[PDB]
Design a protein around this ligand. Structure first.
Ligand SMILES: CCCCCCCCCCCCCCCCCC(=O)OCC(COC(=O)CCCCCCCCCCCCCCCCC)OC(=O)CCCCCCCCCCCCCCCCC
Ligand code: HEA
Ligand code: HEA
Ligand SMILES: CCCCC/C=C\C/C=C\C/C=C\C/C=C\CCCC(=O)O[C@H](COC(=O)CCCCCCCCCCCCCCCCC)COP(=O)(O)OCCN
Ligand SMILES: CCCCC/C=C/C/C=C/CCCCCCCC(=O)O[C@H](COC(=O)CCCCCCCCCCCCCCC)COP(=O)(O)OCC[N+](C)(C)C
Ligand SMILES: CCCCCC/C=C/CCCCCCCCCC(=O)O[C@H](COC(=O)CCCCCCCCCCCCCCC)COP(=O)(O)OC[C@@H](O)CO
Ligand SMILES: CCCCCC/C=C/CCCCCCCCCC(=O)O[C@H](COC(=O)CCCCCCCCCCCCCCC)COP(=O)(O)OC[C@@H](O)CO
Ligand SMILES: CCCCCC/C=C\CCCCCCCCCC(=O)O[C@H](COC(=O)CCCCCCCCCCCCCCC)COP(=O)(O)OC[C@@H](O)CO
Ligand SMILES: CCCCCCCCCCO[C@@H]1O[C@H](CO)[C@@H](O[C@H]2O[C@H](CO)[C@@H](O)[C@H](O)[C@H]2O)[C@H](O)[C@H]1O
Ligand SMILES: CCCCCCCCCCO[C@@H]1O[C@H](CO)[C@@H](O[C@H]2O[C@H](CO)[C@@H](O)[C@H](O)[C@H]2O)[C@H](O)[C@H]1O
Ligand SMILES: CCCCCCCCCCO[C@@H]1O[C@H](CO)[C@@H](O[C@H]2O[C@H](CO)[C@@H](O)[C@H](O)[C@H]2O)[C@H](O)[C@H]1O
Ligand SMILES: CCCCCCCCCCO[C@@H]1O[C@H](CO)[C@@H](O[C@H]2O[C@H](CO)[C@@H](O)[C@H](O)[C@H]2O)[C@H](O)[C@H]1O
Ligand SMILES: C[C@H](CCC(=O)O)[C@H]1CC[C@H]2[C@@H]3[C@H](O)C[C@@H]4C[C@H](O)CC[C@]4(C)[C@H]3C[C@H](O)[C@]12C
Ligand SMILES: C[C@H](CCC(=O)O)[C@H]1CC[C@H]2[C@@H]3[C@H](O)C[C@@H]4C[C@H](O)CC[C@]4(C)[C@H]3C[C@H](O)[C@]12C
Ligand code: CUA
Ligand SMILES: [Cu+2]
Ligand SMILES: [Mg+2]
Ligand code: NA
Ligand code: NA
Lengths: 46, 84, 43, 259, 227, 58, 514, 79, 79
């Protein structure tokens, strides 16, 4: 069986709040950054 | 309604087999006969390069780009007409 | 709702850290791209 | 341990392989249309077939071999199949709409008439009528199969189902020959567009339906169905009647009224 | 044309656009009243310590909030449709002008008598004469007689466009293979501006419409100088 | 043919902890690894193709 | 174990969590796109490029917000978490197919990102109208990748609709009639029926566009006798139902939130709320051509569509007044979720009312394809759909996670967001009335002041989004574990604790018939 | 004769916003009439109304394309 | 042109035993043509082929009734 309870029903760890801050920052930041980098790619192509 | 016949005394496998062999497959046999008679190649019509036909806005992704998928040389002209 | 007290309470200093890191992770990469817009348009 | 009648399914890889197969088929079509290569598309088609094979294999394992299809579970699958057929009806409705839109208001490029100038339609009294008798006949023979199964008659169930499949194959071969013989093509304007995309998606559903009946045929040979429990057969018959009804609408609309 | 800090419609230049302003005034009053009533009632529900939490009967009050909105809708629909149908009224134009959209400019055809046609391109910001309007001026304006019923026919030679002139109440899509008709009638001389109103690619923002409304005698002099 | 459903019922109800998609035995693992290898490899390949198509190719 | 649990799931709660994560990430993408839009328009002139790159951003903004943020959150996330709990069911009807509805969405999103990376992107508008979207004006793979992206998203939602309808009809306790199920469950069922019927028509339309682009069909090409306006009919036959799909689960969550924080055991006028949602769903299929009042349709057709569109105000107004009547007499708890719901009620009403302005085909000549439309739909989407999402997220986060948020921070977040969205979209009414077109990268000078204010508002909303991420972090960082929740007697989804066990209702509830 | 032509009058056959068929019909009518006056003992001046109406209503590029296709033998309408 | 007219030729539009519509159509065409010609001051001689075909095909009493109804203002076909 699987682990149950607060912090165990999620595909990411909340054991260490600073490791968590890094994960959430890469997660949400990567989604927010992508359109900026796609626009850059298109402006750089020609 | 509109046809005829007249069972419905109790539906079952025997009745549907009766319909299969006594009405449905005979129908198919008759239409197969009818189709086997009115076959035979019609004369193909003069090519006219109508602009609403033989559309080519992008080449097809097979062959030389200019043949439809089930191209029949006898009856399907290219944009430039029938092939040799 | 009622809750137990925080198992690992997050002090005001800790919150200022997480909040700044969070804001920075949005602002810096986009800022970098936007700052360099001119350096892309002439290419 | 549960005291409800519903099915808790084992964790399964097939949702993920099916999702990825869709990625590979669509990126594959993109690569074929624009970068002159079939590789990705071939991979996606293969992983799609593998996914469907293993997924429906498991459903058979869960039901015939493990007993998980209680009446409640079967009632859910009945709803799911009906809803699925409804979504397929509405898919076809879009292509009928396109057909009537174009044919009821033919534009000047056509000659302002329907069929368009230069279009010579098939005779609907020839192979299209034969096709109609073929699929109507298969609706009679699948109904015989259904009653034979319910009456516990293995031999006649198999015979009737075999006849049904044979008629579905006959339709498919007749339609392939009509496609080759047609003097107009998918590129012949909106007449060719509506004709081949609508009957082509119908033809695909005939092949899907026949494949499903063929699965049922081999499961019947292996004694999977009981006289009362046989939802794969019921679902394939409903799907087959759907395919037959879509054909009738095609025949009246595109072949007959549209000629 | 629009002016800085404008809140509402451009001033009406045709009788139909005046009708629309009066109709919008009517409808916006209703919008303000309903939005404000909802805001008020929210604040009213939230500002008492009195309670009533048992089951409330709903039948009586739902008659009110179905019949009242139904009446309000009818009081909007009635003037709306009247204007709709008056726009469609047979008017017998004295002049027909065609416009064809392209990527990214408009062409005009005046072919009632002579075969006059021309293209109409935005003036680039770098070529504007002083005091002319950024993104709005064109090199060749749609010269038209004022105080006369004009049939505009609209189509396209490539992708969708849409031919709009807000102060006359005009917006007609420009669809290849299709000839769309609208009617144009200016109460006043002047210059009246519009912009392409269906996304049509790279320079959608930069293919404006400029009508130049002049007295009939001047329009006739202009047509004659095109020979 | 003869009715061997009971043998399959015994096979697929065996308490061996296997999930249904592997409970058939070793052939299931093979078919699964083929399927998953093609899906993951094809996906990587599709990513490579995106990389290729994202830039002008002379 | 990790792969089994999170890639091979057959669990409605875990799949709901996957959808909430996916949709939160998509929301970041769609926010970034919205900021690029408003940066381009934030001062007159050109920032990025011409209308192509601009409208690739516009087009992507819309698809991401609709298909990857709202629908996955509302239906995939809250639907999968809450629907089985609210009816005492042990999972969804098709728990394995449920997982494929989820896993189709990362490939769908991948196809959309690919469309914007190859060639010059799909700068078509989310409507993807031909001929601009065809193979001459948009040669190359971008539009095809966009079509395939929609195909995958469509299959995901069609199969999810089948799952939800089946679950809701078939898996209630035997004593529970449909008129004893909670309004959120109703709202999901009706949304699912709308998806089931509308998405296949979109699929037909975009497949015809695909074949016009690649197989030399001419459904939409006058040269072959086709018609660009047929595509519009097929698209909007789906696209008007689609906006009701976007709001109906929000209506259902608002009903639960307003009831809960009013201290009530039930919403006012339950059967009226069911009637109104079913009426909205039905009327939502017979109005689509109000998106085509300037294409040149006959006047009688425009008169019909004007009138039929306005009818929807009547059931919608029943729901608004019934939420108000739920507040009435309540012991009001001014929780953050309640604030979101109250903002929903007012701001959704404003957007609905400008929808009724637009319903008038005569006035819509002047307002069509202007920012007045943009203002209408962002009031119902950015301040309706999104406010319902935020209210549901703050309300149910302790159930899904086991942890409480900091309410003061959540109230701050609400306040910032409220200012930002209104500053962004209220001036867009003026821009539309005075004639600013949609899908423009730059505007005549007169329009500068309101575009400037609107762009400044978009930055305030960005600050709220960043703050939201911090707030979620702080709750998982501090780990305040839930003890007790009030009103469980009328909110069944809470009664198995927070978070509920992996398997719930293994022994079903007991409900007798009498 | 019966002239004073300013522009095409309202035509109850074509009362809606889509005027495509009105342009097409007068183009056809003119060329049908013109063909009839040439193959017989008559003169094209009788065809003049249709000429004016279609010249007024029809986009120059439609006329030009239709003319080219009549010359080519690919005009799909019957004349 | 085609003189030495003997009788009405086969007409693919009316290939069946029922020829009512053939008589009717040529009767309409002739009188339509004659109205167009007489108005614009042309020559009705170009209408002659329709005149010969309808006189060959149509019963005398039909033509006579139709003529009477045209003169009365009760002819239900469009001329
Ligand atoms: C409504 C959503 C909340 C919005 C919050 C932000 C906006 C403030 C609330 C806004 C204050 C409420 C009253 C609306 C003010 C509009 C100004 C106006 O004169 O409107 C004029 C018309 C066109 O009219 C004309 O032809 C101009 C003739 C008169 C011009 C006189 C010149 C000087 C007047 C000064 C006015 C400057 C306005 C600048 C305004 C600059 C805004 C940034 O424009 C329009 O239709 C725009 C309206 C679109 C339809 C939506 C209405 C829904 C909101 C009503 C409930 C609000 C409750 C309180 C509000 C409660 C909030 C909780
Ligand atoms: C959540 C999304 C959502 C919702 C719910 C709605 C709801 C409505 N929408 Fe809209 N709409 C969009 C999203 C939405 N819309 C989108 C995305 C577009 C643009 C597509 C594009 O072009 O890209 C659009 C475009 C759009 C147009 C086309 C405008 C144009 O392009 O020119 C029209 C026209 O009729 C319209 C009307 C309406 C109406 C009448 C409603 C009604 O359902 C509103 C009913 C609600 C009320 C009326 C308020 C509550 C009622 C009361 C308090 C009772 C009293 C009220 C009265 C008596 C009036 N919408
Ligand atoms: C749901 C739909 C949605 C939403 C939410 C938004 C949000 C925003 N939109 Fe959107 N927009 C559209 C749908 C949406 N839009 C559509 C359909 C179009 C038309 C496209 C076309 O013309 O083809 C459009 C067009 C459009 C334009 C017009 C472009 C033009 O005509 O050129 C503009 C311009 O300002 C704009 C701006 C914004 C802004 C500033 C926001 C901001 O308010 C966004 C701010 C941030 C949020 C609302 C939060 C984001 C959400 C989350 C982070 C979820 C968090 C997750 C959990 C809690 C689990 N949009
Ligand atoms: C019974 C006999 C017929 C059986 C069916 C045959 C195949 C149909 C397959 C699916 C139909 C779907 C796509 C329809 C595309 C057109 C195929 C129409 C059927 C067909 O086969 O049409 C042929 C053209 O095929 C062509 O272009 C090339 C076709 C191959 C490429 C197809 C690529 C497009 C795939 C798009 C799929 C979209 C799926 C969307 C699902 C979304 C669900 C929500 C016609 O041949 P022709 O030479 O032009 O004229 C005959 C002249 N002698
Ligand atoms: C554009 C359209 C705009 C539309 C605007 C419409 C506004 C409508 C507002 C009108 C509401 C009028 C409702 C009147 C119902 C009152 C019934 C009642 O008064 O409540 C009681 C029953 O309540 C019950 O089930 C029901 C109890 C009261 C609840 C009745 C409905 C409540 C409505 C609340 C409305 C909030 C605002 C809505 C939005 C406008 C009966 O009370 P009695 O004292 O006789 O005996 C009780 C006490 N003893 C013990 C001393 C006997
Ligand atoms: C269950 C059914 C399965 C399907 C079987 C096939 C049935 C086909 C019915 C098709 C009827 C519509 C066909 C319309 C096509 C146009 C035909 C037409 O318009 O024909 C006219 C009569 O039409 C007419 O349909 C008269 C129409 C009504 C005729 C009805 C005939 C069959 C009746 C059966 C009723 C059964 C009961 C049904 C209720 C359950 C006759 O005039 P033309 O022939 O023009 O001759 C003029 C030329 O000779 C010279 O210029
Ligand atoms: C040349 C060859 C090309 C082939 C291309 C591939 C296409 C073919 C797909 C054909 C579909 C085959 C479906 C086989 C399903 C087998 C599993 C099954 O039938 O499972 C049955 C349950 O049904 C269920 O899940 C019902 C499951 C419903 C499946 C419906 C499938 C329709 C699929 C259409 C997909 C594409 C749609 C088209 C889009 C354009 C199992 O229950 P029972 O039967 O009661 O047995 C239990 C008793 O034994 C107990 O006593
Ligand atoms: C251009 C290309 C774009 C699209 C690419 C293709 C995208 C998808 C790849 C799909 C691969 C499908 C793989 C097989 C799926 C089988 C699903 C199925 O059969 O699901 C069943 C439920 O749906 C039911 O019945 C009834 C419904 C059966 C649905 C079968 C699959 C249809 C997939 C396509 C449908 C498209 C929509 C068609 C209309 C437009 C069983 O549900 P489970 O949760 O599994 O089990 C429950 C257990 O109790 C069983 O014992
Ligand atoms: C953040 C998550 C986003 C996910 C979305 C996908 C975005 C991926 C965009 C990648 O963009 C590329 O980045 C390169 C950077 O290496 C650029 O090369 C450019 O820059 C290089 C590095 O400085 C030079 O060496 C090259 O010559 C020059 O063309 C290139 O134009 C650009 O297309
Ligand atoms: C629309 C959403 C985005 C809102 C805007 C975010 C606000 C800006 C946040 C910070 O962004 C940073 O700005 C620096 C400048 O302040 C940049 O340094 C750049 O400029 C510096 C100062 O000129 C140099 O030292 C650096 O080397 C050079 O990369 C740096 O790249 C960028 O990360
Ligand atoms: C997941 C997003 C994927 C989008 C896929 C876009 C289509 C790419 C297919 C083509 O890939 C490349 O084509 C080249 C020219 O033939 C060669 C090269 O070897 C091949 O690899
Ligand atoms: C392990 C799981 C599955 C992973 C599978 C990985 C498949 C990788 C195969 C790569 O082979 C490429 O195939 C391309 C197409 O795919 C070829 O392009 C070719 O393909 C075309 C069609 O046959 C020709 O038109 C072109 O000349 C030519 O560039 C190209 O040469 C070659 O590098
Ligand atoms: C009859 C039905 C269910 C009642 C029940 O069994 O509880 C109720 C529920 C909602 C009701 C409707 C809504 O209250 C909206 C409308 C209110 C008007 O006062 C009558 C018609 C009106 C359209 C109502 C008719 C009918 O009384 C409905 C449809
Ligand atoms: C083998 C099986 C006998 C029943 C049993 O296995 O006990 C019999 C019964 C019905 C038979 C099938 C049916 O008669 C229908 C088909 C008849 C054709 O001759 C082809 C084979 C065909 C498919 C038969 C194959 C085989 O002989 C079947 C399958
Ligand atoms: Cu032309 Cu927009
Ligand atoms: Cu709509
Ligand atoms: Mg438009
Ligand atoms: Na059965
Ligand atoms: Na700009």
């Amino acid at each position: 069986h699987y682990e149950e309870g607060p912090g165990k029903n999620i595909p990411f760890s909340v054991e260490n709040k600073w490791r968590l801050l890094a994960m959430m920052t890469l997660f949400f930041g990567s989604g927010f950054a992508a359109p900026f980098f796609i626009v850059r790619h298109q402006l750089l192509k020609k | 309604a509109s046809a005829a016949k007249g069972d419905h005394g109790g539906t079952g496998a025997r009745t549907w087999r009766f319909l299969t062999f006594g009405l449905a497959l005979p129908s198919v046999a008759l239409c197969t006969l009818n189709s086997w008679l009115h076959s035979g190649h019609r004369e193909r019509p003069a090519f006219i390069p109508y602009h609403h036909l033989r559309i080519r806005t992008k080449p097809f992704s097979w062959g030389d780009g200019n043949h439809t998928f089930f191209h029949n040389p006898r009856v399907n002209p290219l944009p430039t007409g029938y092939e040799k | 709702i009622t809750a137990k007290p925080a198992k690992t309470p997050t002090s005001p200093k800790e919150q200022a850290i997480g909040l700044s890191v969070t804001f920075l992770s949005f602002l810096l990469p986009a800022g970098w791209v936007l700052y360099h817009l001119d350096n892309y348009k002439k290419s | 341990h549960q005291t409800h009648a519903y099915h808790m399914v084992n964790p399964s890889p097939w949702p993920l392989t099916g999702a990825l197969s869709a990625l590979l088929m669509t990126s594959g079509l993109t690569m074929w249309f624009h970068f002159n290569s079939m590789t990705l598309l071939m991979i996606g088609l293969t992983t799609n077939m593998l996914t469907m094979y293993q997924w429906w294999r498991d459903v058979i394992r869960e039901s015939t071999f493990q007993g998980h299809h209680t009446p409640a579970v079967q009632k859910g699958l009945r709803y799911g199949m009906i809803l699925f057929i409804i979504s397929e009806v509405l898919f076809f409705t879009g292509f009928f709409w396109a057909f009537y839109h174009s044919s009821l208001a033919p534009t000047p490029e056509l000659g302002g008439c329907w069929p368009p100038t230069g279009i010579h339609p098939l005779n609907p009294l020839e192979v299209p009528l034969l096709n109609t008798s073929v699929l109507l006949a298969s609706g009679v023979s699948i109904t015989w199969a259904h009653h034979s199964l319910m009456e516990g008659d293995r031999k006649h169930m198999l015979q009737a189902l075999f006849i049904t499949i044979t008629l579905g194959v006959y339709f498919t071969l007749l339609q392939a020959s009509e496609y080759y013989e047609a003097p107009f093509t998918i590129s012949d304007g909106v007449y060719g567009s509506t004709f081949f995309v609508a009957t082509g998606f119908h033809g695909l559903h005939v092949i899907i339906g026949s494949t499903f009946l063929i699965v049922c045929f081999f499961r019947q040979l292996k004694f999977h169905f009981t006289s009362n429990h046989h939802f794969g057969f019921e679902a394939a018959a409903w799907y087959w009647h759907f395919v037959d009804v879509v054909w009738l609408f095609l025949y009246v609309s595109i072949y007959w009224w549209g000629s | 044309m629009a002016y800085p800090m404008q809140l509402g419609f451009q001033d009406a230049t045709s009788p139909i656009m005046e009708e629309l302003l009066h109709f919008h005034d009517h409808t916006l009053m209703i919008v303000f009243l309903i939005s404000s009533l909802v805001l008020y009632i929210i604040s009213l529900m939230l500002t008492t310590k009195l309670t009533h939490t048992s089951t409330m009967d709903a039948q009586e009050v739902e008659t009110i909030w179905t019949i009242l909105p139904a009446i309000i809708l009818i009081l909007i629909a009635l003037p709306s449709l009247r204007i709709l149908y008056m726009m469609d009224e047979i008017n017998n134009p004295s002049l027909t002008v065609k416009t064809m959209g392209h990527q990214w400019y408009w062409s005009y055809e005046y072919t009632d008598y002579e075969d006059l046609s021309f293209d109409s391109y935005m003036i680039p910001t770098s070529e504007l004469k002083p005091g002319e309007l950024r993104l709005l001026e064109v090199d060749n304006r749609v010269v038209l007689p004022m105080e006369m019923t004009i049939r505009m026919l609209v189509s396209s030679e490539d992708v969708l466009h849409s031919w709009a002139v807000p102060s006359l109440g005009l917006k007609t899509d420009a669809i290849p293979g299709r000839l769309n008709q609208t009617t144009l009638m200016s109460s006043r001389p002047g210059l009246y501006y519009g912009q392409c109103s269906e996304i049509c690619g790279s320079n959608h923002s930069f293919m404006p419409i400029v009508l130049e409304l002049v007295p009939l005698k001047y329009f006739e002099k202009w047509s004659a100088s095109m020979l | 043919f003869e009715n061997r459903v009971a043998e399959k019922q015994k096979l697929f109800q065996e308490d061996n902890g296997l999930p249904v998609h592997l409970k058939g035995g070793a052939t299931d693992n093979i078919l699964y690894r083929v399927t998953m290898t093609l899906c993951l490899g094809g996906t990587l390949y599709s990513l490579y193709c995106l990389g290729w198509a994202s830039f002008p190719h002379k | 174990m990790f792969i089994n649990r999170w890639l091979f799931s057959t669990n409605h709660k875990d799949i709901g969590t996957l959808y909430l994560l996916f949709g939160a990430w998509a929301g970041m993408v769609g926010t970034a796109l919205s900021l690029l839009i408003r940066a381009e328009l934030g001062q007159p002139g050109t920032l990025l490029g011409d209308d192509q790159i601009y409208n690739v951003v516009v087009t992507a903004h819309a698809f991401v917000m609709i298909f990857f943020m709202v629908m996955p959150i509302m239906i995939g996330g809250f639907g999968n978490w809450l629907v089985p709990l609210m009816i005492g069911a042990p999972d969804m009807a098709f728990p394995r197919m449920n997982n494929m509805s989820f896993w189709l969405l990362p490939p769908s999103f991948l196809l959309l990102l690919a469309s914007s990376m190859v060639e010059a992107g799909a700068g078509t508008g989310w409507t993807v109208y031909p001929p601009l979207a065809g193979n001459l004006a948009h040669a190359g793979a971008s539009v095809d990748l966009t079509i395939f992206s929609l195909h995958l998203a469509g299959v995901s939602s069609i199969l999810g609709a089948i799952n939800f309808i089946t679950t809701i009809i078939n898996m209630k306790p035997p004593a529970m009639s449909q008129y004893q199920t909670p309004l959120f469950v109703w709202s999901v069922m009706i949304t699912a029926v709308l998806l089931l019927l509308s998405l296949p028509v979109l699929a037909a339309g975009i497949t015809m566009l695909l074949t016009d682009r690649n197989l030399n069909t001419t459904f939409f090409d006058p040269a072959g006798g086709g018609d660009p306006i047929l595509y519009q009919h097929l698209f909007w036959f789906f696209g008007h139902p689609e906006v009701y799909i976007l709001i109906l689960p929000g209506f259902g969550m608002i009903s639960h939130i307003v009831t809960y924080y009013s201290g009530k055991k039930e919403p006012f006028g339950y059967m009226g709320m069911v009637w109104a949602m079913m009426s909205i769903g039905f009327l939502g299929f017979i109005v689509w051509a109000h998106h085509m009042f300037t294409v040149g349709m006959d006047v009688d057709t425009r008169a019909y569509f004007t009138s039929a569109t306005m009818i929807i105000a009547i059931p919608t107004g029943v729901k608004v007044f019934s939420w108000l009547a739920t507040l009435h007499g309540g012991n009001i708890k001014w929780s953050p979720a309640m604030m979101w719901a109250l903002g929903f009620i007012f701001l959704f009403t404003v957007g609905g009312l400008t929808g009724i302005v637009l319903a008038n085909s005569s006035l819509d000549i002047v307002l069509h394809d202007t920012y007045y439309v943009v203002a209408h739909f962002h009031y119902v989407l950015s301040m309706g759909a999104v406010f319902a999402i935020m209210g549901g997220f703050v309300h149910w986060f302790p159930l899904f996670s086991g942890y409480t948020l900091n309410d003061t921070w959540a109230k701050i977040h609400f306040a910032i967001m409220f200012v930002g969205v209104n500053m962004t979209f209220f001036p867009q009414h003026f821009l539309g009335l005075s004639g600013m077109p949609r899908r423009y990268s730059d505007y005549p000078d007169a329009y500068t002041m309101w575009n400037t204010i609107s762009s400044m508002g978009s930055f305030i909303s960005l600050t709220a989004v960043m703050l939201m991420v911090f707030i979620i972090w702080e709750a998982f960082a501090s780990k305040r574990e839930v003890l007790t929740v009030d009103l469980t007697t009328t909110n069944l989804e809470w009664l198995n604790g927070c978070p509920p066990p992996y398997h719930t209702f293994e022994e079903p509830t007991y409900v007798n018939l009498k | 004769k019966i002239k004073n032509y300013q522009t095409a009058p309202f035509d109850s056959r074509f009362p809606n916003q889509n005027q495509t068929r009105n342009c097409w019909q007068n183009y056809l009518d003119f060329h049908r009439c013109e063909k009839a006056m040439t193959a017989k003992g008559g003169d094209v001046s009788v065809c003049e109304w249709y000429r004016r109406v279609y010249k007024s209503l029809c986009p120059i590029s439609w006329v030009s394309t239709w003319d080219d296709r009549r010359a080519e033998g690919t005009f799909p309408g019957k004349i």
